[PDB]
Structure 1
């Protein structure tokens, strides 16, 4: 047991500074989530299809969290209210339940969006309306139950233990548990949105595989400017001489595969020597319905014009084909056929990044979270292991406003971005 006055670290200037932040951020949170709660109700009186579970839950948790926290905080730090062990822990249970319910609502919103990116086909089977409804109802009950623990025994005074140097009458073990659960589901939100951000960057650039087998380098000079036009169009190009390749699924993870081989053999129709081991090894390779386009050098003087392109086009059509366009068939010098090679390169590219505005919003979320939870929960971790000075206490007071800004910025992130809610609000005006 300690004294109420030890937890009131603010001076007449620090108190005014705080009251400003508490009542500005607080009033805007109260009013913002109210308008969101109003428009959700109006929307469900016209069109029933939109959910509003992860938008409404957060609107409740924020508004409630705000009224209780803003009022409690100011009454303790400005009015200097000295309340009973169970009376304090009751007002405290008000912020713990509400702020947990808030972060848990951002958690289920993130598990929804993670399932939609990871398994989009299985998402409609697993993420369903009746499963989702239960999820918020059990989110809320568990959150309340965590906040009810200090009032019915799990406190520093009843359980003769080490008291919190930031939270009056709270047991250090209750704190470690709450930081535990809060951190647990807070870190998942961070991972889920990192996964979604990763998955989107892999698709931003189309990966291209240009393999060529050339003798006098005439198909090399072709492939060099086939790869040039593609790299120019934002392609993750990787040109490989058929003399230095691996038949072990060479084409795996490639959007567009290009096989450039030169037509050789004097008496008969023959492939390039480099492309010869790669041709037989097409089975061991993937090409399992891959977008494959063919090219190659030959001569109009020769009986079988670019037959090597044909033999490949035939062997690919038997397997997964998906032949984007009819094979490019240049003569002895592609030097003047420059226009034809780039011309075919354009239309073969012509037959086939990442939604940055949505991806920006996911980056903002993490930025906001790291700023509003990181420092706050860091001072909470300090108290857990040992003591803390007057400075650490006063810094925590201004770190408390951090998550009040989070309560304010939330409607602007999720609700305001909802096309469904945006139209539902516009509805309320005359025609």
Structure 2
């Protein structure tokens, strides 16, 4: 060529111009540069803090984030190198760009593979897991994995080709050998098929010991016990519980506590002359034996005022019935005098003591399993469609329609690298603190 065989030179069927050309250009460039910076931000907090670069779990995030960065950098580079300067790509300069993107996804799948192995060791060798998967072990596994990932990108650059082999070309990518894609597609397809199976088994094994779901049922008229429950809700949410907070007026007692292994009942006391539970709680209290409390871990809280004869008599009545039902009361009830906002240190302190009802390792294994499946599903949603396009290319021919959706499916591949740093921020509670360490 000619017009040039250039990276990001797609068929570009244009419904509207030049607003599309102008607006999509700025939009796509801004999206790309945002990714490079936000994945550069993830790379920073990890290398910056020692409490994380010694963890084997952050050798997994850092690997993903530098894979996301390798691709987002190639995106912005090739976008500004062609849509702004209109420069031409030779054979090697083209394959290097494409190989970089290919390497970014390879290492991403390779990282999810190593994570599955770590979880398999945690499942099969829970006792000695800490001494098996160590910082020097994790570095070697990831360094090896990247060299295997890089090698595949360079293989096309180096040997496999249309030009060098005079082989059948790919209808999507210039210079690319069709039989190389079969090898590439098959390798990642097998790995992903295993990772999908593994991540399901990992998550299933993580629920065999414990689920990490807390239930909070509160009865409140003024809102003091609602504020108390919402405060307890966020402390348990940070500590790795899937917290479900419900007003007593909206629940049915039958089988209420099923599926939860921590249940926190809160109720205010309204003894005008006697002792009475908050009215929305009474229906639950009267049918409490239907909830499934026997053997379950529970604890009570409630707002009251000491100038009444029976200070927080409601939590007394609930705890006594929970004892009579064979519930496992984890600790003594929280009794808040006066305004709960003026006693927040106790509410948070109590929630911290209740937190230990389920061991840290069980909750941590569940959020690790939950986090991995989210990374995986996002990766299948974004990169999946593009892979399906490449499958259409190798076996049979393309279609005019598949060449058009490819322009938008390839943009899905980019926003996978943008939401992964967002996923790390929402689930890795330690990364948030390391971030705030640098203000």
TM-score class normalised by the smaller sequence? 0.5 to 0.7
1:294 matched residue in structure 2? 300
Q: Look up the SS of the partner of 1:414 in the other structure.
A: helix
Per-residue CA deviation, residues 193-228 of structure 1 (Å, 9 max, x unaligned), is 211222244456899999999999999999999999
Alpha-carbon shift at residue 398 of structure 1 (Å): 0.8
Q: Look up the SS of the partner of 1:378 in the other structure.
A: helix
Aligned length: 429
Instruction: Report the more deviating stretch, 233-242 or 212-221.
Output: 212-221
Q: Look up the SS of the partner of 2:342 in the other structure.
A: coil
Distance change in 2, residues 1:387/1:119 (3 Å): same
Distance change in 2, residues 1:317/1:155 (3 Å): same
Distance change in 2, residues 1:32/1:198 (3 Å): same
**Are the equivalent residues in 2 in contact too, given 1:114–1:193 (CA < 8 A)?**
no
Per-residue CA deviation, residues 107-144 of structure 1 (Å, 9 max, x unaligned), is 32332233223432343343222221111111111111
Q: Look up the SS of the partner of 1:400 in the other structure.
A: helix
Structure 2 CA distance, aligned partners of 1:38 and 1:298? 49
Matches within 5 A, 1:239-258: none
Structure 2 CA distance, aligned partners of 1:216 and 1:8? 60
Alpha-carbon shift at residue 27 of structure 1 (Å): 2.1
Alpha-carbon shift at residue 87 of structure 1 (Å): 2.3
Distance change in 2, residues 1:164/1:253 (3 Å): same
Q: Look up the SS of the partner of 2:244 in the other structure.
A: strand
Q: Look up the SS of the partner of 1:208 in the other structure.
A: strand
Instruction: Report the more deviating stretch, 149-158 or 265-274.
Output: 265-274
Alpha-carbon shift at residue 373 of structure 1 (Å): 2.4
Per-residue CA deviation, residues 173-206 of structure 1 (Å, 9 max, x unaligned), is 1111111222232233322221122224445689
**Are the equivalent residues in 2 in contact too, given 1:33–1:59 (CA < 8 A)?**
yes
Larger radius of gyration: 1
Distance change in 2, residues 1:150/1:269 (3 Å): closer
**Are the equivalent residues in 1 in contact too, given 2:305–2:337 (CA < 8 A)?**
yes
**Are the equivalent residues in 1 in contact too, given 2:218–2:225 (CA < 8 A)?**
yes
1:201 matched residue in structure 2? 207
Alpha-carbon shift at residue 70 of structure 1 (Å): 3.3
**Are the equivalent residues in 1 in contact too, given 2:275–2:313 (CA < 8 A)?**
yes
- Name which of 336, 340, 344 aligns with 2:346: 340
Matches within 5 A, 1:181-200: 181-200=187-206
TM-score normalised to the size of structure 1? Answer: 0.59
- Name which of 411, 418, 421 aligns with 2:428: 418
Aligned-residue Cα RMSD (Å) equals 11.1
TM-score normalised to the size of structure 2? Answer: 0.58
Alpha-carbon shift at residue 90 of structure 1 (Å): 2.1
**Are the equivalent residues in 2 in contact too, given 1:9–1:390 (CA < 8 A)?**
no
**Are the equivalent residues in 1 in contact too, given 2:371–2:427 (CA < 8 A)?**
no
**Are the equivalent residues in 2 in contact too, given 1:264–1:270 (CA < 8 A)?**
yes
Instruction: Report the more deviating stretch, 382-391 or 124-133.
Output: 124-133
**Are the equivalent residues in 1 in contact too, given 2:203–2:366 (CA < 8 A)?**
no
Alpha-carbon shift at residue 96 of structure 1 (Å): 1.6
Alpha-carbon shift at residue 161 of structure 1 (Å): 1.2
Structure 1 CA distance, aligned partners of 2:295 and 2:415? 51
Structure 2 CA distance, aligned partners of 1:93 and 1:232? 40
Structure 2 CA distance, aligned partners of 1:92 and 1:425? 33
**Are the equivalent residues in 1 in contact too, given 2:11–2:403 (CA < 8 A)?**
no
Structure 2 CA distance, aligned partners of 1:98 and 1:367? 17
2:392 matched residue in structure 1? 382
**Are the equivalent residues in 2 in contact too, given 1:299–1:332 (CA < 8 A)?**
yes
Alpha-carbon shift at residue 426 of structure 1 (Å): 2.0
Alpha-carbon shift at residue 31 of structure 1 (Å): 1.5
**Are the equivalent residues in 1 in contact too, given 2:12–2:407 (CA < 8 A)?**
no
1:160 matched residue in structure 2? 166
- Name which of 265, 271, 276 aligns with 2:271: 265
Distance change in 2, residues 1:52/1:415 (3 Å): farther
2:380 matched residue in structure 1? 370
Structure 2 CA distance, aligned partners of 1:375 and 1:426? 37
Structure 1 CA distance, aligned partners of 2:223 and 2:39? 68
**Are the equivalent residues in 2 in contact too, given 1:203–1:354 (CA < 8 A)?**
no
Structure 2 CA distance, aligned partners of 1:427 and 1:264? 46
**Are the equivalent residues in 2 in contact too, given 1:200–1:354 (CA < 8 A)?**
no
Q: Look up the SS of the partner of 1:243 in the other structure.
A: helix
Alpha-carbon shift at residue 414 of structure 1 (Å): 3.1
Distance change in 2, residues 1:50/1:7 (3 Å): same
**Are the equivalent residues in 1 in contact too, given 2:56–2:138 (CA < 8 A)?**
no
